[PDB]
RNA sequence: AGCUUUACUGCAGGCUGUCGCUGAG
RNA sequence: CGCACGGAGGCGAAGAACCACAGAUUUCCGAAUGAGAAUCUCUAACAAUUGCUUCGCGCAAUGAGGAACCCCGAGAACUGAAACAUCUCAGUAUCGGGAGGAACAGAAAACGCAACGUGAUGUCGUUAGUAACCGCGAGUGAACGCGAUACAGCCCAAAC
């Protein structure tokens, strides 16, 4: 079986979807945890550095 | 699918917010939706 | 605990803890470990009191030894809040210290002798 | 503090009801019960509520056909407003 | 006269000997049954409680904090590293014990600010120290002309920054000449090479 | 317009609740009629009749009802 | 870059002595 | 009568529009705190951790955010050395914790132009690429003092 086409038809499940915190469509709905904003893991907002250049 | 009561109300919105540019507007700004969306051709959250 | 090494009979604390309430309406007491401590030192100590019940026990641990090399008599209370009522507090009181009795430099003097001899 | 009713619910279909089934439809507020659509109705029309049955529609608001008893008339009713 | 607390002081100077030797042997075998942030009624040095800024008062909490021995709890490196930087077991940190102890403390009482604390102690493999806190919002204190200070809105979390006095010594900052160059006046300031 | 803010502070704390149910009701019918398509409407009506209502509820705050 | 080994240099880990916890005859 | 110049209609001399300050209102989720949940739901709530305590959540605290700045911890590698291991990149990137409008520091167990001298602390200019480090390779690199800025000096523990 092709892991390209052939393998794309069974992609069905709903994983990521609308968070209640942050409005983005990133809660891991069988994770309970979004991967944006870190609702369900963090009370603190997810944020990094890396998320811009450094010396900006 | 079994979807919730907010889940509802979400999809209720996009189906509104898919609606055009009343014509009166038009006339009133002297003259497009840029956020029309297609149910199949487009893919809403969730 | 530790700084106790024999056991004051129950009858006897009665008696001593007598002595000081008219000790210090009739003489004159110290109460607290800090002004015990420099009665015992300045010699104007009879007859001190310490209490067993005291946590930690290094605020005491000192009074015996020291009593001691100074020749003042102590007893021991097993109660910390009896000793400070007896003194004349609301509070309690690790250790006090009579400092000069008034009508009871009898009985103190027997108490004195009663520990003495209780070892 | 939000109120029951909203406004009546009015089309073709909710005609029929209200001709053959001596019935109102409403836009009524989401959060409202069976018994909350049933009680607002009575005290602002002053009718007796049979039966009322509810449906979150895809306007984003909630609908409620209520069935009047044979005692008001629905068409009546619907027509002093 | 000597005060009756020089005597607890004189004691500690050799928690090997004497009564308080056996006190410790005692003590202990309750202490390692408590658990790692234990709040207690009277401190176990009192003299050096006092020293410290403690007083017998509304809002002064004291608890004694228990932390490991030795070296840092490091995990080896799961990618190149220079033989420099392959190291695991000599690696320690650069905080000391005392200074884990009040921050594992301030965070049990989340409302409440670190003041000072001091040792008591330590058994094969693990270390005691008993850590004065101060509530900043009781009244009790709002009004204290020595303590009051700590109420400031710049004291809160000091000991998170570092601002206590174990932390400030921890710091190098203790000298005020020679060999406090890189310490004074921030580690942070001067780079991180202190 | 129709109604001003002192004519709101002439009334007692029974004739505002009055009024207030009054213009709900107004209202109510207002949009009735335009849930109906009715076009006997004047748009500037339901307007203030939302306006007014705000009025009311401000002053009985004011006033302690 | 992956891999190997009696390549160079190190790092975990195991074994072992010693110090602390640790005391009485 | 927003952007927004339409149609209908309305508001304003009862002084509207508009602007400033103050106040009212302010749904649900959200640190999110009664419990659960992809913004909904289920049967009175400071959940959790603390301080005080009338030992009753009665009175209080914490939580999260913020452009960067600040403080305390954890801490690479590409790279440079024309290879490379110490060294270098660099206490940099990145990570954990936390404060404020600024932080931190701060009234000598100092300095050591050695003096019959200076006199809390930051910072700027200089001292100086000096002293010091270093397969003594490549590289790394202060301080005292001085000229300025601004200046401010105090409180406990104990003795009694
Ligand atoms: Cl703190
Ligand atoms: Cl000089
Ligand atoms: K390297
Ligand atoms: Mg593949
Ligand atoms: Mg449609
Ligand atoms: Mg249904
Ligand atoms: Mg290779
Ligand atoms: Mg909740
Ligand atoms: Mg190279
Ligand atoms: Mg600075
Ligand atoms: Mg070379
Ligand atoms: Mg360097
Ligand atoms: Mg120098
Ligand atoms: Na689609
Ligand atoms: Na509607
Ligand atoms: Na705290
Ligand atoms: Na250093
Ligand atoms: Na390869
Ligand atoms: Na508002
Ligand atoms: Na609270
Ligand atoms: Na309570
Ligand atoms: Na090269
Ligand atoms: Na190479
Ligand atoms: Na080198």
């Given at each position: 079986t092709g892991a390209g086409t052939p393998?794309?038809?069974?992609?069905?499940?709903?994983?990521?979807?609308?968070?209640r915190r942050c409005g983005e469509k990133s809660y891991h709905t069988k994770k309970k945890v979004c991967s944006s904003c870190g609702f369900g893991k963090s009370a603190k907002r997810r944020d990094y550095e890396?998320?811009?250049k450094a010396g900006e | 699918g079994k979807?919730?009561?907010?889940?509802?109300?979400?999809?209720?919105?996009?189906?509104?917010?898919?609606?055009?540019?009343?014509?009166?507007?038009?006339?009133?700004?002297?003259?497009?939706?840029?956020?029309?969306?297609?149910?199949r051709r487009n893919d809403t959250d969730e | 605990p530790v700084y106790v090494d024999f056991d004051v009979p129950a009858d006897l604390e009665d008696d001593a803890l007598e002595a000081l309430?008219?000790?210090?309406?009739?003489?004159?007491?110290?109460?607290?470990?800090?002004?015990?401590?420099?009665?015992?030192?300045?010699?104007?100590?009879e007859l001190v009191f310490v209490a067993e019940d005291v946590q930690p026990e290094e605020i005491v641990m000192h009074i015996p030894e020291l009593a001691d090399e100074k020749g003042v008599p102590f007893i021991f209370v097993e109660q910390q809040d009896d000793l400070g009522h007896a003194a004349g507090l609301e509070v309690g009181s690790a250790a006090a210290a009579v400092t000069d009795a008034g009508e009871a430099d009898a009985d103190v003097e027997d108490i004195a002798d009663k520990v003495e001899e209780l070892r | 503090s939000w109120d029951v009713i909203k406004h009546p619910h009015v089309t073709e279909k909710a005609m029929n009801d209200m001709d053959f089934q001596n019935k109102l439809q409403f836009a009524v507020d989401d959060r409202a019960s069976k018994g909350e659509v049933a009680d607002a109705v009575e005290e602002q029309y002053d009718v007796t509520v049979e039966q009322?049955?509810?449906?979150?529609?895809?306007?984003?608001?909630?609908?409620?056909?209520?069935?009047?008893?044979?005692?008001?008339?629905?068409?009546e009713v619907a027509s002093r407003i | 006269a000597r005060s009756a607390y020089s005597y607890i002081r004189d004691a500690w100077e050799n928690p090997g000997d004497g009564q308080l030797a056996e006190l410790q042997w005692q003590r202990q075998q309750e202490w390692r049954n408590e658990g790692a942030v234990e709040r207690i009624e009277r401190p176990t040095r009192?003299?050096?409680?006092?020293?410290?800024?403690?007083?017998?008062?509304?809002?002064?909490?004291?608890?004694?904090?228990?932390?490991?021995k030795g070296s840092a709890r490091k995990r080896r490196h799961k990618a190149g590293r220079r033989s420099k930087r392959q190291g695991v077991t000599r690696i320690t940190r650069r905080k000391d014990i005392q200074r884990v102890a009040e921050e594992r403390a301030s965070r049990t009482f989340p409302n409440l600010r670190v003041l000072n604390s001091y040792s008591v102690g330590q058994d094969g493999r693990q270390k005691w120290h008993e850590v004065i806190l101060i509530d900043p919002n009781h009244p009790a204190i709002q009004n204290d002309d020595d303590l009051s200070w700590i109420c400031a809105d710049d004291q809160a979390d000091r000991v998170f920054r570092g601002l206590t006095g174990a932390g400030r010594r921890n710091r190098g900052l203790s000298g005020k000449g020679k060999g406090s160059e890189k310490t004074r006046p921030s580690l942070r300031s001067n780079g991180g090479k202190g | 317009t129709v109604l001003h803010v002192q004519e709101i502070r002439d009334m007692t704390p029974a004739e505002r609740e009055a009024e207030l149910d009054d213009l709900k009701t107004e209202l109510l019918n207002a949009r009735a009629v335009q849930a109906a398509g009715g076009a006997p409407e004047?748009?500037?009506?339901?307007?203030?009749?939302?306006?007014?209502?705000?009025?009311?509820?401000?002053?009985?705050?004011?006033?302690?009802?």
């Open positions: 393998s794309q038809g069974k992609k069905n499940t709903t994983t990521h979807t609308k968070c890396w998320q811009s | 979807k919730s009561k907010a889940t509802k109300k979400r999809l209720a919105k996009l189906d509104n917010q898919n609606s055009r540019v009343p014509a009166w507007v038009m006339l009133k700004t002297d003259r497009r939706n840029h956020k029309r969306r297609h149910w | 309430e008219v000790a210090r309406d009739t003489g004159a007491v110290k109460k607290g470990t800090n002004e015990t401590t420099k009665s015992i030192e300045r010699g104007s100590a | 009322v049955n509810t449906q979150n529609t895809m306007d984003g608001e909630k609908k409620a056909v209520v069935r009047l008893s044979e005692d008001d008339d629905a068409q | 009192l003299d050096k409680a006092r020293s410290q800024g403690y007083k017998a008062k509304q809002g002064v909490i004291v608890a004694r904090v228990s932390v490991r | 004047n748009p500037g009506r339901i307007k203030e009749l939302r306006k007014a209502i705000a009025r009311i509820k401000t002053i009985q705050g004011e006033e302690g009802d």
